[PDB]
Design an enzyme around this catalytic site. Structure first.
Site, PDB file in Angstrom:
ATOM      1  N   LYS A 260       0.828  -1.190   0.005  1.00 43.23           N
ATOM      2  CA  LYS A 260      -0.050   0.084   0.015  1.00 43.23           C
ATOM      3  C   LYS A 260       0.875   1.246  -0.004  1.00 43.23           C
ATOM      4  CE  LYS A 260      -4.641  -1.294   1.819  1.00 43.23           C
ATOM      5  NZ  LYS A 260      -5.482  -0.854   2.986  1.00 43.23           N
TER       6      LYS A 260
ATOM      7  N   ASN B  23      -4.519   2.255  -2.006  1.00 46.46           N
ATOM      8  CA  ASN B  23      -5.480   0.940  -2.184  1.00 46.46           C
ATOM      9  C   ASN B  23      -5.898   0.952  -3.407  1.00 46.46           C
ATOM     10  OD1 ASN B  23      -7.888   2.509  -1.457  1.00 46.46           O
ATOM     11  ND2 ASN B  23      -8.811   0.619  -1.029  1.00 46.46           N
TER      12      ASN B  23
ATOM     13  N   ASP C  12     -10.198   3.517   1.483  1.00 46.10           N
ATOM     14  CA  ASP C  12     -10.536   2.937   2.627  1.00 46.10           C
ATOM     15  C   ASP C  12     -11.426   3.840   3.487  1.00 46.10           C
ATOM     16  OD1 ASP C  12      -9.081   0.454   2.345  1.00 46.10           O
ATOM     17  OD2 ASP C  12      -7.404   1.667   2.598  1.00 46.10           O
TER      18      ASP C  12
ATOM     19  N   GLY D 101      -2.606   6.143  10.280  1.00 45.26           N
ATOM     20  CA  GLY D 101      -3.063   6.402   8.898  1.00 45.26           C
ATOM     21  C   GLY D 101      -4.416   6.236   8.674  1.00 45.26           C
TER      22      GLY D 101
ATOM     23  N   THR E 134       0.165   9.536  21.996  1.00 47.61           N
ATOM     24  CA  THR E 134       1.287  10.165  21.908  1.00 47.61           C
ATOM     25  C   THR E 134       0.982  11.540  20.901  1.00 47.61           C
ATOM     26  OG1 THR E 134       2.650   9.704  19.846  1.00 47.61           O
ATOM     27  CG2 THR E 134       2.867   8.542  21.889  1.00 47.61           C
TER      28      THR E 134
HETATM   29  O1  LIG Z   1      -8.693  -7.664   1.291  1.00 48.66           O
HETATM   30  C1  LIG Z   1      -8.582  -7.181   0.314  1.00 48.66           C
HETATM   31  O2  LIG Z   1      -8.621  -7.681  -1.053  1.00 48.66           O
HETATM   32  C2  LIG Z   1      -8.493  -5.583   0.352  1.00 48.66           C
HETATM   33  C3  LIG Z   1      -8.501  -5.273   1.471  1.00 48.66           C
HETATM   34  C4  LIG Z   1      -8.328  -3.756   1.959  1.00 48.66           C
HETATM   35  O3  LIG Z   1      -6.881  -3.695   2.251  1.00 48.66           O
HETATM   36  C5  LIG Z   1      -8.693  -3.007   1.004  1.00 48.66           C
HETATM   37  O4  LIG Z   1      -7.993  -1.647   1.278  1.00 48.66           O
HETATM   38  C6  LIG Z   1      -8.085  -3.213  -0.321  1.00 48.66           C
HETATM   39  O5  LIG Z   1      -8.485  -2.424  -1.621  1.00 48.66           O
HETATM   40  C7  LIG Z   1      -8.391  -4.817  -0.753  1.00 48.66           C
END
Ligand SMILES: O=C(O)C1=C[C@@H](O)[C@@H](O)[C@H](O)C1
Length: 258
Positions: free
Chosen positions: A64, A85, A100, A127, A150
């Site tokens: 990512k 993502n 997300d 994040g 923190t």
């Molecule tokens: O398990 C998955 O296929 C995903 C999980 C998340 O990280 C999502 O952010 C990603 O777009 C796809």
């Protein structure tokens, strides 16, 4: 059109199962396939994607951030969360997006009436927390509050939001209409009766905080909807069409049972 998910591992991803359900509801001739890309072969990513004629892909663990340098352009949201993502291949150009946060926020919007007047506390400053706070900021009128262990983590933040520590969140806990845990936590001892308690994890189906909040007889909400809504939001970007949220969630649930 051809879509995918990249990651290592990739085989337990429920993205292809889910995007397909969406394609079948919309009557679309799309594929969405899982692509296993070890770290050691990531340098050949432009070639793994383009040989398969991919239109857009999701990006998951552990790439990512790893993807970011390979992008031609990246949106403010991704840049801010520091993670991508979703990538759009749009006439050979790679563009990075991050769905997300908007994905969590659009889900909450459906199951929380009048979120615009909500007093929202978020736990965590990292994040995922950042990405949700950015999205909320645009729709919530009362100032957001983010609590963290923190204070320094907020230095690269960009929002005019209240920023407090964890003990201060504990003692003012009853000012909040929604609490969102983005931390993998607080004492719920001042937890107002009506307060919705949310975690962005859905495995396990309930984390410790949700468990106790539920015994206190509060409404609870895990990260299931985030997962459907972040993919639905990728799909909107890639295709300019409307995803069938019900079809996408119903299949993921059926798969989860079993
Ligand atoms: O398990 C998955 O296929 C995903 C999980 C998340 O990280 C999502 O952010 C990603 O777009 C796809």
């Amino acid at each position: 059109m051809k879509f995918a998910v990249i990651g290592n591992p990739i085989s337990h991803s429920l993205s292809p199962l889910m995007h397909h359900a969406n394609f079948q509801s919309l009557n679309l001739e799309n594929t969405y396939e899982a692509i296993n890309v070890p770290v050691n072969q990531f340098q050949d990513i432009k070639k793994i994607i383009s040989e398969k004629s991919i239109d857009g892909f999701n990006v998951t663990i552990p790439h990512k951030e790893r993807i970011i340098p390979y992008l031609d352009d990246i949106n403010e949201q991704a840049k801010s969360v520091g993670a991508v993502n979703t990538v759009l291949v749009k006439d050979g150009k790679w563009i990075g997006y991050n769905t997300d946060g908007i994905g969590y926020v659009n889900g909450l919007k459906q199951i929380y009436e009048g979120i615009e007047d909500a007093y929202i506390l978020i736990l965590g400053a990292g994040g995922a927390s950042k990405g949700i706070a950015n999205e909320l900021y645009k729709i919530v009128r009362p100032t957001l509050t983010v609590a963290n262990r923190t204070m320094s983590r907020f230095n690269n933040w960009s929002l005019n939001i209240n920023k407090i520590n964890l003990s201060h969140a504990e003692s003012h806990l009853d000012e909040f209409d929604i609490i969102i845990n983005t931390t993998p936590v607080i004492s719920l001892n001042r937890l107002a009766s009506h307060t919705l308690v949310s975690d962005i994890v859905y495995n396990p189906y309930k984390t410790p905080i949700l468990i106790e909040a539920e015994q206190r007889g509060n409404p609870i909400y895990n990260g299931l909807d985030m997962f459907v809504h972040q993919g639905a939001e990728s799909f909107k970007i890639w295709t300019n069409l409307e995803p069938d949220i019900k079809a996408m969630k119903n299949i993921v649930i059926q798969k989860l049972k079993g």
